Design a protein around this ligand. Sequence first.
Ligand code: CHL
Ligand code: CLA
Ligand code: CLA
Ligand SMILES: CCCCCCCCCCCCCCCC(=O)OC[C@H](COP(=O)(O)OC[C@@H](O)CO)OC(=O)CCCCCCCCCCCCCCC
Ligand SMILES: CC(/C=C/C=C(C)/C=C/[C@@]12O[C@]1(C)C[C@@H](O)CC2(C)C)=C\C=C\C=C(C)\C=C\C=C(C)\C=C\[C@@]12O[C@]1(C)C[C@@H](O)CC2(C)C
Ligand SMILES: CC1=C[C@H](O)CC(C)(C)[C@H]1/C=C/C(C)=C/C=C/C(C)=C/C=C/C=C(C)/C=C/C=C(C)/C=C/C1=C(C)C[C@H](O)CC1(C)C
Ligand SMILES: CC1=C[C@H](O)CC(C)(C)[C@H]1/C=C/C(C)=C/C=C/C(C)=C/C=C/C=C(C)/C=C/C=C(C)/C=C/C1=C(C)C[C@H](O)CC1(C)C
Lengths: 217, 220, 238
Amino acid sequence: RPMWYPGATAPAHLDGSMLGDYGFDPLRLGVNKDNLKWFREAELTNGRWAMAAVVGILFTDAVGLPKFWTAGAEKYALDNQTLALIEVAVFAVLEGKRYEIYKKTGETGFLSFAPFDPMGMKSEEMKLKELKNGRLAMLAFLGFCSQAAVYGKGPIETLQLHLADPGHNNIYTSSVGPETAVTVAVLCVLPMIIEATKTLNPGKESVPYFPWNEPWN
Amino acid sequence: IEWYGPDRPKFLGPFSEGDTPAYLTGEFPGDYGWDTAGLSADPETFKRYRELELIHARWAMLGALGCITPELLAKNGIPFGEAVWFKAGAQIFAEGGLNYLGNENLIHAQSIIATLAFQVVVMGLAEAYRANGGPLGEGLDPLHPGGAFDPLGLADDPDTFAELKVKEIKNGRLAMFSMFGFFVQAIVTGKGPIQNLDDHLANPTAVNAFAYATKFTPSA
Amino acid sequence: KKTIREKAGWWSNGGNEKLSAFYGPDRGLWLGPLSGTTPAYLTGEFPGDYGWDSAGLSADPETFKRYRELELIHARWAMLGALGCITPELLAKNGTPIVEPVWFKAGAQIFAEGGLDYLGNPGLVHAQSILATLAVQVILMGAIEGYRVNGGPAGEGLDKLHPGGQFFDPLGLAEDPDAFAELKVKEIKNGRLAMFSMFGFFVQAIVTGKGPLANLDEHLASPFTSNAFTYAQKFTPQ
Ligand code: CHL
Ligand code: CLA
Ligand code: CLA
Ligand SMILES: CCCCCCCCCCCCCCCC(=O)OC[C@H](COP(=O)(O)OC[C@@H](O)CO)OC(=O)CCCCCCCCCCCCCCC
Ligand SMILES: CC(/C=C/C=C(C)/C=C/[C@@]12O[C@]1(C)C[C@@H](O)CC2(C)C)=C\C=C\C=C(C)\C=C\C=C(C)\C=C\[C@@]12O[C@]1(C)C[C@@H](O)CC2(C)C
Ligand SMILES: CC1=C[C@H](O)CC(C)(C)[C@H]1/C=C/C(C)=C/C=C/C(C)=C/C=C/C=C(C)/C=C/C=C(C)/C=C/C1=C(C)C[C@H](O)CC1(C)C
Ligand SMILES: CC1=C[C@H](O)CC(C)(C)[C@H]1/C=C/C(C)=C/C=C/C(C)=C/C=C/C=C(C)/C=C/C=C(C)/C=C/C1=C(C)C[C@H](O)CC1(C)C
């Protein structure tokens, strides 16, 4: 199967049993199986929320609406504390049904339909598509917020700025230019160090000595 | 369309398989399966309510025609001192009394007490005869006697009889609905039915009932 | 016979004698200790059975069933209505700019040319046509109630009053049959209270002419000063 860098060797717990498995767990956060299931569900939840948020931001910036980092400041039909209370009350029960549904199913559901699947499109191909689009949309929202904090422009306005001058209007000419250039170079040279570790210890796994890993076993 | 039996037309249409009670077999005319209130669970109460329905229906058909006709004739040229139906009774207190078609020579009624007295006498006689029979019937049906009430003979075949029963009760339910409407929209509008139709046809979107919606608000 | 903490009502899941006050022979009745001969057909099997059939209208079991369904549906509609006839006025006296929060005048908001803004916010529903509103409503409620009476996309082989699939009991509050049995009573009692209070809303409109919360406020200002007897001579025949 493909990996996160070409010719990588997955850890012992990323057996490919799960979907979207590319052997990426360098900090070994998912060596426990219960933690790994919970993290798969949290990955999918953050991804669903990020997908909805990405399309909402793209919509509100495509049309004549305030920018998404200022929309909370605008004036609405209800005051912000009443909104927060109704949101807390609704999501208590909603996420409680979702938590019960995770404890029972191990997967997602809305309230009582353990799988929320009126239209029976629950393949595992569709689970893989959900996970991949969710990772992509998590990155997309992180980028929305990041390049709306670096500039004061929305997503597609920054896109237009890039397309106006791609060589000079990019992340490496921004306020965060040098740190991102350095981290990109470090990331590109990182897999050669990882492959050195894999090469000099053929078929052996090294514990990185972290708290969550229980590396003494 | 059957009008009888289990595969009869019903009052919620396709939505009506499990709403009809067990006692509303498709035996009687107009049985669309509407007894949500369960008021006809007892067969005897059901029979009495059927009689009430049919008599109200016939009286309401006559009354619907009697409220529509004078107004039509009123604009189509004929003098009608008070054509509107909910003041047609107050003609007795006019100068010349209640002239039938406007003709001072037709009836020329002046006293409402005598009119009412004759009405009670003959209506009581007729309704008593209706209940238990008389000169036009001894042991006939309480609802469809026939004989003296079929000089034309429309319903000697049972199938024609059944379909005309359904037609009767349905025109009658229509007339009862329409007469209820006459009442409520006379109280609300204060004009006749034909004038209400004319006003609705003149401006349908701003001459409807919702124009008279804020009429009965208490407002302290 | 018990200990202090069982008297004080601790230890949930001890409920089989707590249904005795709402079901069964020796339950609470409509005149309490002054209602001896309950109708034989009010056996205490259905929720809200207080033995009240003074008029004997539910003597037939099938019309009793139909009347039970009428009662519960009226109760649910009246609960929604009692909440909806006070929510706008409360929200307006708290400061939301609703243009007519009084309930018997709330329908006349759609004839103002600014339309029927929902919470007084024009960016919201902004309905102008009462006829289009009514048409939408008729279509939707006809589908909805025809689905209610025989079945529909939300379950067909379910109970006529308490379907309780995944669409109408999505929180699963009624999976315990004893919790279900006592929640039925809570439903019907809150609903009878709401029906009585909606009759009260109707009569307090026709009589008083103000809002129900305004009536509460002017009663709490000086109760003996202002009451329903204040408006007793209002319907004087002149
Ligand atoms: C599947 C679609 C379908 C639907 C939804 C209905 C629905 C209805 N049919 Mg039916 N039918 C349908 C198909 C068919 N019907 C019939 C044949 C019949 C007949 C013969 C009859 C019916 C009747 C009825 C009504 C009985 C329920 C009722 O009384 O409402 C009660 C609920 C209300 C009245 C709520 C009000 C609705 C609206 C929103 C009112 C507006 C509110 C006001 C502003 C409030 C006023 C404020 C005041 C208080 C101040 C109801 C409207 C009966 C009828 O006409 O009675 C009225 C009737 O006699 N149908 C046939 C031929 C086989 C059908 C074919 O598919
Ligand atoms: C899929 C996500 C995605 C996409 C399509 C873009 C696209 C863009 N970004 Mg954004 N960005 C992202 C994620 C993304 N970014 C994230 C996660 C961050 C946080 C680190 C940022 C932070 C950021 C800043 C601070 C700036 C941009 C800028 C730009 C523009 C120039 C490209 C550049 O220098 O950025 C390179 C982006 C990175 C190094 C961040 C990581 C990007 C990951 C690796 C995804 C790469 C793309 C992916 C593999 C495939 C794309 C899918 C599809 C759309 C084709 C371009 C419109 C610049 C701009 O607006 O110029 C006018 C700018 O100043 N971005
Ligand atoms: C079939 C019988 C029938 C007919 C032909 C009419 C016709 C009319 N009525 Mg009358 N009415 C009827 C029955 C009828 N009504 C009944 C039973 C009631 C008692 C609830 C009323 C109460 C009533 C009042 C209080 C008023 C009218 C008025 C009117 C006129 C305007 C229409 C209107 O406001 O709608 C109102 C209609 C109703 C309140 C209920 C009737 C139900 C109909 C027959 C079913 C729906 C059919 C419709 C085409 C579908 C619309 C779908 C969607 C928009 C809801 C119009 C001439 C108004 C008037 O005089 O304007 C000049 C007026 O003020 N009517
Ligand atoms: C960015 C900032 C810097 C981040 C550094 C890294 C963060 C580490 C996050 C650890 C997540 C939890 C680990 C899961 C736990 C886990 O995986 O257990 C693994 C390990 C112990 O293993 P056990 O033998 O208990 O495991 C057996 C069980 O797993 C059952 O088999 O954890 C520890 O040794 C203790 C770690 C405590 C870590 C929390 C310390 C709290 C720090 C905050 C202090 C605040 C002080 C001020 C208060 C006002
Ligand atoms: C990016 C992201 C997560 C990235 C995680 C990564 C890379 C994890 C990497 C690793 O862990 C692994 C894999 C393995 C480990 O061994 C190694 C590391 C490296 C540690 C999550 C985003 C998660 C993003 C989410 C959940 C976004 C939700 C967005 C919402 C709700 C937006 C809401 C709004 O924006 C709108 C819609 C409109 C506005 O007007 C109003 C508001 C409210 C502002
Ligand atoms: C079915 C069902 C079912 C469920 O179960 C329950 C329920 C719901 C209850 C049910 C329902 C019911 C109903 C709806 C009913 C209705 C009724 C009516 C409307 C009647 C009318 C009714 C009506 C009627 C009679 C009418 C009549 C009429 C008349 C006489 C008239 C007279 C007159 C005229 C000509 C005019 C002139 O100038 C004068 C006068 C003298 C005035
Ligand atoms: C038991 C018994 C016994 C013996 O034997 C006999 C007898 C006596 C007969 C019996 C009794 C009975 C009774 C008492 C009854 C009652 C009823 C009621 C009250 C109802 C209500 C009922 C009520 C109801 C439904 C209500 C409803 C409501 C609603 C919908 C609402 C709506 C609305 C709102 C929100 C507001 C807005 O703005 C408007 C409107 C539109 C207005």
